[PDB]
Design an enzyme around this catalytic site. Structure first.
Site, mmCIF file in Angstrom:
data_model
loop_
_atom_site.group_PDB
_atom_site.id
_atom_site.type_symbol
_atom_site.label_atom_id
_atom_site.label_comp_id
_atom_site.label_asym_id
_atom_site.label_seq_id
_atom_site.Cartn_x
_atom_site.Cartn_y
_atom_site.Cartn_z
ATOM 1 N N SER A 295 56.848 16.806 139.221
ATOM 2 C CA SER A 295 56.497 18.224 139.429
ATOM 3 C C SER A 295 55.167 18.413 140.113
ATOM 4 O O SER A 295 54.874 19.536 140.439
ATOM 5 C CB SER A 295 56.430 19.039 138.113
ATOM 6 O OG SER A 295 57.749 19.285 137.571
ATOM 7 N N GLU B 262 66.503 16.821 140.476
ATOM 8 C CA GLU B 262 66.945 15.519 141.078
ATOM 9 C C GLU B 262 65.836 14.652 141.654
ATOM 10 O O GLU B 262 65.921 13.426 141.633
ATOM 11 C CB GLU B 262 68.004 15.715 142.175
ATOM 12 C CG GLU B 262 69.323 16.203 141.607
ATOM 13 C CD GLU B 262 69.349 17.692 141.384
ATOM 14 O OE1 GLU B 262 68.377 18.380 141.787
ATOM 15 O OE2 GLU B 262 70.353 18.160 140.804
HETATM 16 C C1 LIG Z 1 58.479 18.030 136.789
HETATM 17 O O1 LIG Z 1 57.771 17.074 136.519
HETATM 18 C C2 LIG Z 1 59.437 18.660 135.837
HETATM 19 N N1 LIG Z 1 60.155 17.556 135.258
HETATM 20 C C3 LIG Z 1 61.481 17.595 135.051
HETATM 21 O O2 LIG Z 1 62.167 18.615 135.230
HETATM 22 C C4 LIG Z 1 62.115 16.271 134.639
HETATM 23 C C5 LIG Z 1 61.919 16.031 133.167
HETATM 24 C C6 LIG Z 1 61.187 15.061 132.470
HETATM 25 C C7 LIG Z 1 61.280 15.256 131.111
HETATM 26 C C8 LIG Z 1 62.070 16.353 130.809
HETATM 27 S S1 LIG Z 1 62.718 17.217 132.197
HETATM 28 C C9 LIG Z 1 58.861 19.749 134.878
HETATM 29 N N2 LIG Z 1 57.455 19.543 134.542
HETATM 30 C C10 LIG Z 1 56.976 19.016 133.422
HETATM 31 C C11 LIG Z 1 55.507 18.839 133.472
HETATM 32 O O3 LIG Z 1 54.880 18.951 134.524
HETATM 33 O O4 LIG Z 1 54.869 18.584 132.455
HETATM 34 C C12 LIG Z 1 57.741 18.684 132.349
HETATM 35 C C13 LIG Z 1 57.156 18.254 131.041
HETATM 36 C C14 LIG Z 1 59.264 18.757 132.347
HETATM 37 S S2 LIG Z 1 59.867 19.972 133.449
#
Ligand SMILES: *C(=O)[C@@H](NC(=O)Cc1cccs1)[C@@H]1NC(C(=O)O)=C(C)CS1
Ligand SMILES: *C(=O)[C@@H](NC(=O)Cc1cccs1)[C@@H]1NC(C(=O)O)=C(C)CS1
EC number: 3.5.2.6
Lengths: 256, 256
Positions: B39, B135
């Site tokens: 993210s 994805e």
């Molecule tokens: C980006 O990193 C996002 N990650 C995901 O959607 C994948 C996942 C990993 C674990 C559960 S879903 C979002 N961002 C974050 C973050 O930045 O902390 C998290 C914790 C999950 S959603």
């Protein structure tokens, strides 16, 4: 009742008033009990600044010195040599609770007596601005200077932000500043659902005083205006933000 | 050395790059090693969006449906009926890591391929956007789709936030969003003394990838731009936020 429970858990006195602006349904716990308003007054202070100045007039640059700095100056301490515009001062005051920025805005509007005058004018007979920051935080039990009530704060904040004490372009400014507060994350914002937009202003003072006043927007529908005020019996008490967060959760259950 | 010791304590691989923008001194550990960027790409994506729109153009309202919602939609899930403006989407993406919001924004800037082009345009030849969220988080060891390096992420975030890929008023928006991030209290922020302002964007992905990119303003002096990336060798590995907070403490000491 759940507010009594929180008072017990946190050994504190709570003052609460909430108005669901869709329905006029109300949620009150010691709503007329006086508390030190502390920094929540900054929100009303900007309200009155906005009545008095055009948006364009907020670009006036204010020069100041170390003499204008007080106990907490997170933004204003960076710009002694460049000055800050009135807009920038409003931002700092509301988003960082910068106390010198408050004092600077207050001088610009004629001081605490003039603020009080303008609060009276908008129908607020409760709130009693008397002093500059941070002296306004020194309030002993039984004293009325620099106090207000949960109900009065709610009614005043609604008046500036949501009704007609400001025109809509200036209401938008105040709401944007308060939406983007940095100081409030553990308080009212912690007792609302993510995705519910919050505009708030926090306070801390003597007697463990710990306050938050807010506008809360459901995803659709009319906003709630809320004041959560608290204090404790010892002058040097600590406060615990969780109280305000838990109290918020009780309000939202009682209205929803 | 101390980064070594943290890989040992947490059975993880660490990727670190820090740049003190004042002195140009650097702290690196595996700085050119690839990780899934997860993210953290949200921050760059907003950078691109800001560059390509006037601030006023962010007020464009995007309509969307349930079909636009994906695995994690804390804000977007509440506003299907009202839509959200690009501004609100940028706030959701950055401050809550709203995956749907990132996707909606990616669409308006012409998708992953188009985000790749724009990042090449700003001087980033390393970051490889290829998929939508979530994805993009599925990266196996040795693949390069949706990866970057600590160095490249630092370079690119600095470009947007501090340098000249954006005009100042747009720089201000990006920075204020990231300062008010809600997802990062236990990572870089937990490695920095309270009071120092911290702008950051977190990520989490497969193989226990746990990332945080940040700008840190020390009380006075120019900012530090920091990436801490991490990953582990099992696909279903848990991560531990404490690794990133501890790596951060190390960087702060190496730079003072
Ligand atoms: C980006 O990193 C996002 N990650 C995901 O959607 C994948 C996942 C990993 C674990 C559960 S879903 C979002 N961002 C974050 C973050 O930045 O902390 C998290 C914790 C999950 S959603
Ligand atoms: C207003 O409440 C302000 N408080 C004071 O100046 C009294 C204190 C200074 C330090 C401890 S009590 C400012 N506002 C805030 C806030 O809104 O949260 C805080 C916490 C301290 S300064």
């Amino acid at each position: 009742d759940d507010f009594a429970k929180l008072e017990e858990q946190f050994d504190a006195k709570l003052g609460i008033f909430a108005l669901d602006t869709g329905t006029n349904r109300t949620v009150a716990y010691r709503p007329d009990e006086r508390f030190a308003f502390a920094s929540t007054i900054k929100a009303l202070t900007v309200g009155v600044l906005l009545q008095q100045k055009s948006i364009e007039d907020l670009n006036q640059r204010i020069t100041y010195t170390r003499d204008d700095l007080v106990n907490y100056n997170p933004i204003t301490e960076k710009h002694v040599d460049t000055g800050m515009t009135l807009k920038e001062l409003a931002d700092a005051s509301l988003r960082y609770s910068d106390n010198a920025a408050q004092n600077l805005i207050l001088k610009q509007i004629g001081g605490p007596e003039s603020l009080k005058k303008e609060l009276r004018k908008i129908g607020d007979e409760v709130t009693n601005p008397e002093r500059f920051s941070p002296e306004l935080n020194e309030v002993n039990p039984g004293e009325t200077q620099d106090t207000s009530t949960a109900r009065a704060l709610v009614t005043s904040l609604r008046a500036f932000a949501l009704e007609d004490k400001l025109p809509s372009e200036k209401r938008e400014l105040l709401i944007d500043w308060m939406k983007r507060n940095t100081t409030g994350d553990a308080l009212i914002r912690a007792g609302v659902p993510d995705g519910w937009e919050v505009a708030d202003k926090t306070g801390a003072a003597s007697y463990g005083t710990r306050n938050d006043i807010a506008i809360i927007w459901p995803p659709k529908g009319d906003p709630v205006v809320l004041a959560v005020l608290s204090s404790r019996d010892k002058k040097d008490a600590k406060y615990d933000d969780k109280l305000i967060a838990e109290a918020t959760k009780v309000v939202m259950k009682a209205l929803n």
